[PDB]
A paper describes a structure:
The outer membrane (OM) of Gram-negative bacteria is an asymmetric lipid bilayer with outer leaflet lipopolysaccharides and inner leaflet phospholipids (PLs). To maintain this barrier, the OmpC-Mla system removes mislocalized PLs from the OM outer leaflet, and transports them to the inner membrane (IM); in the first step, the OmpC-MlaA complex transfers PLs to the periplasmic chaperone MlaC, but mechanistic details are lacking. The OM lipoprotein MlaA interacts with trimeric porins OmpC and OmpF, where OmpC appears to play a more critical role in Mla function. Moreover, MlaA itself forms a hydrophilic channel in the OM; it comprises a ‘donut’-shaped architecture (constituted largely by five horizontal helices) and a vertical ‘ridge’ (formed by a ‘helix-turn-helix’ motif) defining the central channel.
We exploited the strong in vivo disulfide crosslinking to trap transient interactions between MlaAQ205C and MlaCV171C and effectively isolated such OmpC-MlaA-MlaC complexes from overexpressing cells, followed by purification on size-exclusion chromatography (SEC). We reconstituted these OmpC-MlaA-MlaC complexes into lipid nanodiscs assembled using the MSP2N2 membrane scaffold protein and E. coli polar lipids for single particle cryo-electron microscopy (cryo-EM) analysis. Initial 3D reconstruction without application of symmetry operators revealed three distinct classes of OmpC-MlaA-MlaC complexes, varying in the number of MlaA-MlaC pairs bound per OmpC trimer (i.e. OmpC3-(MlaA-MlaC)1-3). Consequently, combining particles from these classes yielded an improved density map of OmpC3-(MlaA-MlaC) with an overall resolution of 2.9 Å. The membrane-embedded components of OmpC3-MlaA were well-resolved with side chains clearly visualized, while the density of bound MlaC was limited to 5.0-7.0 Å owing to continuous flexibility. In our nanodisc structure, we can clearly visualize the MlaA donut positioned exactly at the membrane-water boundary of the inner leaflet of the bilayer, with the C-terminal part of the protein protruding into periplasmic space and connected to MlaC at two contact points. Unbiased rigid body fitting of the MlaC model alone in the density positioned V171C adjacent to Q205C (on MlaA), exactly consistent with the engineered disulfide bond forming one of the contact points. In addition, we were able to trace and fit a poly-alanine model of the C-terminal tail helix of MlaA into residual density not occupied by MlaC, accounting for the second contact point. In the final real-space refined model, the manner by which the C-terminal helix of MlaA interacts with MlaC agrees with the AlphaFold2 prediction and strongly validates our biochemical observations, solidifying the idea that this interaction is critical for MlaC recruitment.
Residue numbers in the entry:
A (entry chain F): 1 to 191
B (entry chain D): 11 to 234
C (entry chain A), D (entry chain C), E (entry chain B): 23 to 367
């Protein structure tokens, strides 16, 4: 699960568990892409709450308001987050996962946590800078942001989902998360 | 809102933002932020605002604003007389309610009564450009204080203003290329700064569609 | 303010003004800095009979070291009873100023329709005023006063044997024994005032070297004031005979002064001020027929940083032509720009 | 007192004099409104040494706005040591005035026998006075002092040569280097005094255009006073040699000035005052013989409302004639009555 | 500091000086008692904006009771922000005076090369000075300032058809529109200063034979100071063109004047002083080739009792010789000794 006092330790443990599960069950992911999402739920979804990380997907639109717009950012967002994490994990074909040390974060509302991933085919390293936040409602170390290779991808859809919400409202993105979560992962094929 | 000229206005934007920006504007922005001291930059910023103060007050009077019209008049009088030509922010520290305000050109008055936006064209070496706001800015050249500036000195102020605003945008330059299509987010960003309630420039930095509304009820939302 | 003991309180005050004039006349432009110094004391003799005093002094700081230009503005003292009125003797304001005080709230160009020691139109010497407040405690806003003037004539010991007094001056600011009174009323935000004064003229003022003849000069005035909801709107009409100084060469036989002011108060400190002044002096006994004494429009704004310092600007639009009569009198006919800083402590 | 810091005591005193004159002689008729302004600070360097200093100013408020009259009354500084004396240099009072101050106790009149800068008779300029208290702490009430006077000549603005000083004056106010002293004794109620002074006369004071020639101007002045049981009695007779100014002609060769006053203090503040002064000459020149320079009787009362504001009425009756001697010297020969109130703070 | 309420601060300062000059020259011998009086207020408007003012008066106490010798020294007002510098308009000191004040350490003498109202070198009228401290809060000890001047010239009321000003004076203090600035560097005792001045002169300044003529007048200053370990050493040399007044003859085209002071404040109050002044005149007109205008050495000491009371003796040895140039100009060429007594409060 996620720790309540050390956010860096929880992130390092979650990254190691995800890498070990993918390597130990590599044939399972290829045989069934949906199976990788279930395994990622106990590795990457526990470390980042749906409500805490409700900015990358259905952040500006849908949200948890409007009575019926609840299965896009709070209820069904756990499966969508696992599917997104599973697709990225399935892209690698044996990439090494480096766990960062337990750096001192202190008492603050913004706890930046980053990891290092080195591919074995010679590709440039990708840094997963999952920033955590000490939310009062949820005491677990849940990441409030998702940054890949140094780029702030947490707010990528924040400024892009407003165009669809200006006409269809918050109900237009309610089914967007359901289709993404139900969609299987696409593993990268070597050419 | 759909806009004409879909074939054009795309290649020019890419060339202006991926070739001219990281080769000329970017190297000069780093030196300006570091080599030029902060008090020097602050003095230049207030000088540009003072030259447009006797011009934005007329815009408020045309639409009707006795309270806001006198606010700009006091700022110009104090900056020119008690600040030696507006080199310092005399009115900024004189009253907490008399701080710096975004200038309101002739385009604000036109949009208050309701005018069409028209086509959008990205002028070279200028960036965003529109016929109603940017194209309607050629109306204050007959008023005093602004007519005293010739073509070479006037264009220098525009370059200085762009350089000053580049320093504040250097810290958040990663979001420009974060989106798949940078042209889409740039057009919406400029439109959101000139299509507020009853025009009047841009509104406060907030998002109407339920901004930070789910953070107050995350106790039972984060459990799933 | 600086001393409060044994029932005596002293309120030291003043104001230092650094002012500059911008005009093409080359006669009033340049440095015009000046400072005001004085105190305002008050002593409580008993529970009913009180007393107070006031003194002022203006020193011009634009002069050189070899020249000094200083004068006393007001200097008077007297007692003040609880409910029967107050009486003070000394250098104080006249009776016409009690009604004209509502239309001279302009920052710099104020009170240009009269002059000091001129038929009880401004501050004068030897003024004995008896003023009663609230009509002996009967109605609110109804105030009245009665003033008397001494005798001032030719300078003492300088080639003069008739009309000589210990405080003699030139004939341009001479006046005899006169009596005047002013009545004002303010019920709720609306003010109504009117004063009637009459002062005798000395023998030196009846010579043939100056225009204007008559044994007694009578002055009439009247105006309305409105100061409510941070809005100022006042206008007054004045009709004086042989009282207003038309530049040099004595006074006009008949002048019809008209003043109107308008001011607004903002929440941040800016106080715009727009006023119009008119002076149609007719019945001139020197062939000049109907002429204009003073007519200009002043537009400006005053910004108050705090209760002890403020900044103001002014723009005097002089629309009066410069004919032969104006040149001889010496009245400015061109625009003058006034701007300066005031620090009141 | 507006400053009470550690050894930085400062007292700000002053008053406003609102008075009016009524007399047959128009040369003094009118108003004599003036005011007094100045500070008075005292320091404390050590347990024994003590520093002090005061300044007084007087400006006449009866003048117009085109001119003003200003002069410094007293301006001096010095140190005071415990039971050994004190020396201060500057504009101070003479040693003779220490005994003469018991006579001129009237609110407005009194002290008309002499004039300003009349050697050691009133407040002079360039006075170096050394004063002692209680005779080095030996006896009580016995005090003595000495004074030295500087030399003043013609102003340096115009070519006069001979004796010219920076602080130049006219030919009727110059003085030379003189030495003076005074001895006073203060008993229980009763009091006696005596002063002897002598000032050198410059070459511009004994010309052919002024009556009275000589080199020395030694003067002798006595004194008697009694301040007990709320009554005031004072008598003083003095002999002046070539130092009493008579009109504007010059100085009398020998004059016998006698003066005596009597004042009573009431419970409610009434202070009646009576005084008699004579200035009959003895050895006048240019045809004058046994001519009275000044002779008048002053009777009046003073009402004390409190310690700050007081009212008084004065009535002076001139007992001298109006012959050619008084007309030539321009001496007032008419009764003067002045009433008013003063406010001191 | 006699008033401190709701952010308003008023400070009263001044001194009394009794001077008795001893010299053979008749134009300077005699009493020279003067007094300084003024106030210094400061109002805190906001946290980052504070208002302030300054005023001072000088009244000579050596005059008689019928003459006035009072004049103003400094009278200006301005606003001060948190850290941008300081700007004030009014009667203030020039930019040159900010650098040349290092050698102006003598109690009474010193700084005789320049004069009052001599362009932007001392106090004057219509002075607009902007002073910045610590270079907008960037470095320590590096300060610079700029100044502006008016166009005061001939008096308006003198019947002159040429350029005139309301606050006019004689043809010895007029100045046109000019600009000036100064830069100063501070350190642990050591100091570097320098000022550059250039002001236009009116046409009336060079109408008659005024020795020195020119369209513009330039002034370059510079000096070093050392104030550490109770040691005061300063030396400033400047070269001015048509900016130093020779006297009653006119102006000097070229003037090379250098001054240096040396002081060492002892622990027991005494503060001995030693200064030297020199002024060389070059390119003079009317046949004068090369002569010295002013050259003397001042030796003296100052003894402050605790903080304010001080007694000082001065003796300046004049090295100049009597000739035709000094007689026509009117400059003393003899050694003088001055004694004073300053009581500050
Ligand atoms: C606090 C900050 C500290 C400083 C900061 C920066 C440092 C430096 C700043 C100043 C440097 C300026 C450059 C300079 O300083 O320049 C050079 C120096 C060279 C370079 C050095 C640079 C150094 C840099 C240092 C940098 C350091 C960082 C020398 C010089 O000084 O040049 C001189 C000229 N320039 C200036 O003086 C400064 C300057 C002129 C100023 C410009 C206009 C005024 C602006 C407004 C002020 C703002 C208020 C705050 O410069 C200009 O241009 C514009 C320059 C822009 C900046 C100006 C800022 C001034 C304000 C100061 C800040 C408060 C000046 O020209 C003419 C001027 O005449 C007018 O009077 P009139 O009223 O018209 O009569 C006005 N007069 C003034 O004083 C202005 C005013 O009073 C003073 C204002 C400031 C004072 C303090 C105010 C602050 C108060 C604050 C209180 C809180 C003025 O404006 C005018 O139009 C009219 C009027 O103002 C305009 C109306 C005003 C409206 C304002 C109100 C609005 C408020 C807004 C509220 C909403 C006009 O310009 O005179 C001679 C020319 O000689 C003649 C000539 O040809 O005219 C020859 C002669 O003519 C003949 C003929 O042939 O006809 C020949 C004869 O034989 C004979 O026949 C006669 C015939 O009998 C009769 O005529 O006539 C004769 O007439 C003579 C005189 O008249 C009489 O002796 O003048 C030049 O000498 P020259 O060049 O060396 O040869
Ligand atoms: C609180 C304490 C109070 C006091 C305590 C004691 C009380 C008693 C004091 C007074 C008694 C003294 C005796 C007396 O008072 O004596 C008699 C009275 C007799 C009875 C006395 C009884 C006493 C009773 C006591 C009671 C005890 C219980 C009358 C009289 O006063 O005698 C008179 C003389 N004596 C004095 O005045 C006092 C006296 C003066 C002497 C000066 C001493 C120096 C001052 C000390 C300063 C103190 C320092 C702190 O002397 C002295 O006894 C020395 C004693 C010192 C006394 C002063 C000290 C006071 C200061 C106290 C401070 C603590 C005086 O002689 C000449 C004086 O001239 C100079 O001017 P110049 O040089 O030109 O500038 C100087 N002028 C001064 O004023 C001095 C100065 O300004 C004032 C003094 C200071 C006062 C204030 C100071 C306080 C300030 C402090 C502030 C905090 C002065 O010194 C000089 O030179 C030198 C020069 O200063 C420079 C001095 C150097 C400075 C050094 C200081 C630095 C120190 C260093 C410290 C580290 C010199 O003495 O003049 C006539 C003479 O007539 C003539 C003449 O012949 O000259 C005739 C005529 O000439 C002719 C000619 O032939 O040329 C003839 C013609 O036919 C014709 O031809 C024309 C020809 O065409 C053109 O010429 O002219 C004509 O010229 C005329 C006038 O000039 C113009 O009308 O004078 C005499 O009349 P007469 O004899 O009766 O007939
Ligand atoms: C705050 C209080 C409340 C408000 C005030 C009160 C309310 C209203 C005011 C009263 C109303 C009427 C006033 C008026 O305004 O009245 C009328 C008005 C008409 C109606 C208008 C409205 C009225 C109703 C309004 C109702 C409103 C509700 C017109 C006018 O004004 O009439 C005028 C007359 N009356 C007055 O001015 C008011 C008035 C004058 C004053 C009277 C004295 C009263 C004493 C004061 C009391 C003190 C208080 C404590 O009298 C009086 O009514 C008495 C009344 C008392 C008034 C004083 C009030 C003081 C109040 C103070 C309270 C504390 C005046 O007569 C003469 C005056 O001259 C003197 O100077 P001199 O003696 O020379 O030195 C005295 N001059 C004064 O100023 C007095 C003084 O300075 C001021 C007074 C006080 C002011 C300040 C007080 C406060 C002080 C401080 C207080 C803290 C004065 O007394 C004297 O004698 C001497 C002296 O006072 C009296 C003696 C002293 C004793 C008293 C001491 C008491 C001690 C107390 C001890 C316990 C005497 O009266 O002059 C012309 C006449 O023209 C001539 C003439 O014929 O004489 C022509 C001409 O002559 C000829 C000739 O033939 O010789 C003809 C030629 O052809 C030719 O030949 C030549 C020839 O060649 C050469 O000569 O000359 C020529 O000479 C000229 C001049 O001399 C020179 O140009 O004068 C008249 O003009 P006209 O009638 O219109 O034509």
């Amino acid at each position: 699960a996620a720790d309540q006092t050390n956010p860096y330790k929880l992130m390092d443990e979650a990254a190691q568990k995800t890498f070990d599960r993918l390597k130990n069950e590599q044939p399972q992911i290829r045989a069934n892409p949906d199976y990788l999402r279930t395994i990622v739920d106990q590795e990457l979804l526990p470390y980042v709450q749906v409500k805490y990380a409700g900015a990358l997907v259905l952040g500006q639109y849908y949200k948890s308001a409007t009575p019926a717009q609840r299965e896009a950012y709070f209820a069904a967002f756990r499966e969508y987050l696992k599917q997104a994490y599973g697709q990225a994990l399935a892209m690698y074909h044996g990439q090494t996962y480096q766990i960062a040390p337990e750096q001192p974060l202190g008492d603050k509302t913004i706890v930046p946590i980053r990891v290092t991933i080195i591919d074995p085919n010679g590709r440039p390293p990708v840094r997963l800078d999952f920033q955590w936040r000490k939310n009062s409602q949820t005491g677990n170390w849940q990441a409030y942001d998702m940054i890949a290779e140094g780029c702030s991808m947490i707010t990528t859809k924040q400024n892009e989902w407003g165009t669809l919400l200006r006409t269809k409202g918050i109900d237009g993105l309610t089914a967007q998360l359901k289709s993404i979560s139900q969609q299987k992962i696409t593993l990268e094929e070597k050419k | 809102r759909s806009d004409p000229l879909e074939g054009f206005n795309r290649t020019m934007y890419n060339f202006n933002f991926n070739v001219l920006d990281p080769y000329i504007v970017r190297p000069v922005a780093v030196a300006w932020r570091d080599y030029v001291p902060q008090p020097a930059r602050n003095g230049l910023s207030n000088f540009t605002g003072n030259l447009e103060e006797p011009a934005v007050m007329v815009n408020y009077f045309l639409q009707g604003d006795p309270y806001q019209g006198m606010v700009h008049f006091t700022r110009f009088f104090l900056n020119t007389i008690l600040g030696m030509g507006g080199f310092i922010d005399v009115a900024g520290m004189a009253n907490p309610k008399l701080q710096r305000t975004e200038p309101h050109r002739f385009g604000s008055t036109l949009g208050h009564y309701g005018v069409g936006y028209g086509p959008y064209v990205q002028l070279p070496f200028y960036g965003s450009f529109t016929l109603r706001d940017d194209g309607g800015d050629m109306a204050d050249g007959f008023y005093p204080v602004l007519s005293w500036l010739t073509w070479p000195m006037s264009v220098g102020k525009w370059t200085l203003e762009g350089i000053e605003t580049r320093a504040q945008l250097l810290d958040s330059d990663g979001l420009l290329r974060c989106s798949s299509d940078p042209y889409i987010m740039v057009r919406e960003a400029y439109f959101q700064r000139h299509d507020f309630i009853a025009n009047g420039g841009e509104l406060k930095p907030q998002e109407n569609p339920n901004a930070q509304a789910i953070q107050d009820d995350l106790k039972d939302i984060d459990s799933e | 303010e600086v001393y409060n003991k044994d029932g005596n309180k002293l309120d030291l005050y003043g104001k230092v003004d650094g002012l500059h004039y911008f005009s093409d006349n080359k006669d009033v432009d340049g440095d015009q800095t000046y400072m005001r110094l004085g105190f305002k004391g008050e002593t409580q003799v008993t529970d009913q009979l009180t007393g107070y005093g006031q003194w002022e002094y203006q020193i011009q700081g634009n002069s050189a070291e070899n020249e000094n230009n200083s004068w006393t503005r007001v200097a008077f003292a007297g007692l003040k009873f609880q409910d029967v009125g107050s009486f003070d003797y000394g250098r104080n304001y006249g009776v016409v100023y009690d009604v004209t005080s509502w239309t001279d709230v302009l920052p710099e160009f104020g009170g240009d329709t009269y002059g000091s020691d001129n038929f009880m139109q401004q501050r004068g010497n030897g003024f004995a005023t008896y003023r009663n407040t609230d009509f002996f405690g009967l109605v609110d806003g109804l105030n009245f006063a009665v003033q008397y003037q001494g005798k001032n004539g030719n300078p003492s010991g300088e080639g003069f044997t008739s009309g000589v007094t210990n405080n003699g001056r030139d004939a341009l600011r001479q006046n005899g024994d006169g009596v005047g009174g002013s009545i004002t009323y303010d019920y709720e935000g609306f003010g109504i005032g009117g004063a009637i004064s009459s002062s005798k003229r000395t023998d030196a003022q009846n010579t043939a070297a100056y225009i204007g003849n008559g044994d007694r000069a009578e002055t009439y005035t009247g105006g309305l004031k409105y100061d409510a909801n941070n809005i100022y709107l006042a206008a007054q009409y004045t009709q004086t005979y042989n009282a207003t100084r038309v530049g040099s060469l004595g006074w006009a036989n008949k002048a019809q002064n008209f003043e109107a002011v308008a001011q607004y108060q903002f929440d941040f400190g800016l106080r715009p001020s727009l006023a119009y002044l008119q002076s149609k002096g007719k019945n001139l006994g020197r062939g000049y027929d109907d002429e204009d004494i003073l007519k200009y429009v002043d537009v400006g704004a005053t910004y108050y940083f705090n209760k002890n310092m403020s900044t103001y600007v002014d723009y005097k639009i002089n629309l009066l032509d410069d004919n032969q009569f104006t040149r001889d009198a010496g009245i400015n006919t061109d625009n003058i720009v006034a701007l300066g800083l005031v620090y009141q402590f």
